[PDB]
């Protein structure tokens, strides 16, 4: 019995510990600790009693089967993956959607979701975009920001809250969460001159405009 103490040595580099395996021995107090070394179920029946067996043999065999495959190690299912992020895309940046039906719109980033998709939400009263997921790949991170460090984003919204169901109707659940978050961002974007006018615009490329030549 004992509370599990967190790992002593911090990760210096991925794969390499900060302390050697000798200093580790002198660190866990290992010097003073030398440890010296179903299926049958009986059920009565109205006679006698019969002994049922769990998981009886299959009743069908295919004419041939595929062999079991070898075992790899590094492969993890998607839910266990590590979710990266561009360092420029901090909470408060203004993004630009590039692929969806809301392309060209200067949408406002709030937070990261557990699936790596960005919870981006331009003010619906400005950009006509709701609380929306968006893959961070298809997004240009502009160098403009707003301090949304005091905004209270709900907790019940998650990668299951924006998951498609299966004629799309706006639930009242959406509308209450919409105006709740817009009631906190809309004061914080009108604190900057022309900022609400900026988001109402749509991004486009004119003649002589080269994306590599310009910078965001």
């Amino acid at each position: 019995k004992g509370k599990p103490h967190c790992s002593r040595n911090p990760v210096l580099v991925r794969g390499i510990g900060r302390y050697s395996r000798s200093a580790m021995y002198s660190r866990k107090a290992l010097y003073k600790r030398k440890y010296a070394a179903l299926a049958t179920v009986t059920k009565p029946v109205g006679g006698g009693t019969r002994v049922v067996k769990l998981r009886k043999m299959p009743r069908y065999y295919p004419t041939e089967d595929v062999p079991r495959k070898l075992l790899s190690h590094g492969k993890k299912p998607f839910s266990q993956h590590v979710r990266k992020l561009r360092a420029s895309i901090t909470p408060g940046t203004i993004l630009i959607i590039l692929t969806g039906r809301h392309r060209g719109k200067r949408v406002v980033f709030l937070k990261q979701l557990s699936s790596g998709l960005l919870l981006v939400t331009g003010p619906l009263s400005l950009n006509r975009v709701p609380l929306r997921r968006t893959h961070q790949k298809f997004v240009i991170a502009t160098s403009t920001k707003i301090d949304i460090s005091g905004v209270k984003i709900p907790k019940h919204l998650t990668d299951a809250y924006f998951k498609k169901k299966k004629k799309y109707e706006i639930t009242e659940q959406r509308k209450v969460d919409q105006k709740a978050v817009d009631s906190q961002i809309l004061p914080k974007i009108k604190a900057v001159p022309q900022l609400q006018g900026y988001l109402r615009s749509v991004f486009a490329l004119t003649n002589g405009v080269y994306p590599h030549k310009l910078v965001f």
């Binding site: 030398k34 440890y35 010296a36 070394a37």
Partner: peptide, 19 residues
Amino acid sequence: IAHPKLGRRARARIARGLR
């Protein structure tokens, strides 16, 4: 210690080191 045929008696001292 790293010899099979003539290091058996040697590395029995380590086997008690875990004990």
